[PDB]
Amino acid sequence: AECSVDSQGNDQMQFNTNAITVDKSCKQFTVNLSHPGNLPKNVMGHNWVLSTAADMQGVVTDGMASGLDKDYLKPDDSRVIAHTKLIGSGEKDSVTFDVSKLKEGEQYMFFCTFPGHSALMKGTLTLK
Amino acid sequence: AECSVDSQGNDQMQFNTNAITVDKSCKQFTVNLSHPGNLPKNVMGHNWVLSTAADMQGVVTDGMASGLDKDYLKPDDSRVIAHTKLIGSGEKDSVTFDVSKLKEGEQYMFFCTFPGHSALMKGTLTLK
Ligand SMILES: [Cu+2]
Numbered sequence: 541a542e543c544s545v546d547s548q549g550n551d552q553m554q555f556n557t558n559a560i561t562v563d564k565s566c567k568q569f570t571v572n573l574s575h576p577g578n579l580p581k582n583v584m585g586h587n588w589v590l591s592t593a594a595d596m597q598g599v600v601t602d603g604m605a606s607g608l609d610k611d612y613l614k615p616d617d618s619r620v621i622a623h624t625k626l627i628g629s630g631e632k633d634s635v636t637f638d639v640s641k642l643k644e645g646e647q648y649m650f651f652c653t654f655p656g657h658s659a660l661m662k663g664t665l666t667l668k
Numbered sequence: 669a670e671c672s673v674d675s676q677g678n679d680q681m682q683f684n685t686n687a688i689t690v691d692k693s694c695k696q697f698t699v700n701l702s703h704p705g706n707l708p709k710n711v712m713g714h715n716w717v718l719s720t721a722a723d724m725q726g727v728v729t730d731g732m733a734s735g736l737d738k739d740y741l742k743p744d745d746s747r748v749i750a751h752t753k754l755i756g757s758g759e760k761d762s763v764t765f766d767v768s769k770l771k772e773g774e775q776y777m778f779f780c781t782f783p784g785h786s787a788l789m790k791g792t793l794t795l796k
């Protein structure tokens with residue numbers, strides 16, 4: 541805990557939070573994502589993807605085009621700071637990343653890239 | 669147009685209209701649904717479903733429980749007044765229903781029951 545947060549993507553197409561702050565003392569930060577619900581990945585999969593607020597749009601749009609087999613992420617997208625995989629219900633994944641990749645004074649956004657989901661499944665992240 | 673309306677459901681989970689006025693001189697009313705875009709039915713499928721504003725929530729919950737193969741509509745649901753099938757991009761479907769099944773002063777909603785889409789794809793239908 542302290543440098544980790546548990547996140548949930550449900551069958552209603554929402555995340556349980558919309559603002560995560562990363563404490564400057566953390567060397568690494570972990571996101572544990574679970575998918576409560578009953579629906580399969582192909583109709584209601586979720587991932588936790590991080591980028592800057594300004595890159596988000598590019599990542600969601602190139603992710604959408606890559607398709608379900610690339611977990612709707614462009615392979616080696618260098619706008620992507622960190623991402624989990626695309627999980628279906630009852631599945632779980634965790635991503636740990638370097639806090640050094642964040643810089644204080646920049647807005648980040650986490651979001652899901654499964655088509656249409658970022659309209660509700662998104663939140664701000666900031667290093668503080 | 670005369671006793672019919674054309675409706676579109678696109679890749680960003682939006683219907684092109686959000687209010688339909690059926691007119692009382694119509695014995696029947698037709699809604700012609702189409703889906704602009706490129707995503708298939710299992711990612712961005714849409715249907716047009718009508719029920720009272722009061723029954724929409726159960727129709728949505730039971731719908732989501734029916735599965736993709738049942739087009740996310742509970743078969744022979746008593747509360748659905750008219751519905752198209754679920755369609756992906758490039759697919760088209762229509763429904764004609766009799767205007768005697770709507771009464772004056774009752775509030776009706778049209779909506780899409782594909783998981784997560786109702787919160788964003790819905791509108792009111794009025795007998796005038
Ligand atoms: Cu999602």
Ligand SMILES: [Cu+2]
Binds near residue numbers: 677780
């Ligand atoms: Cu829909």
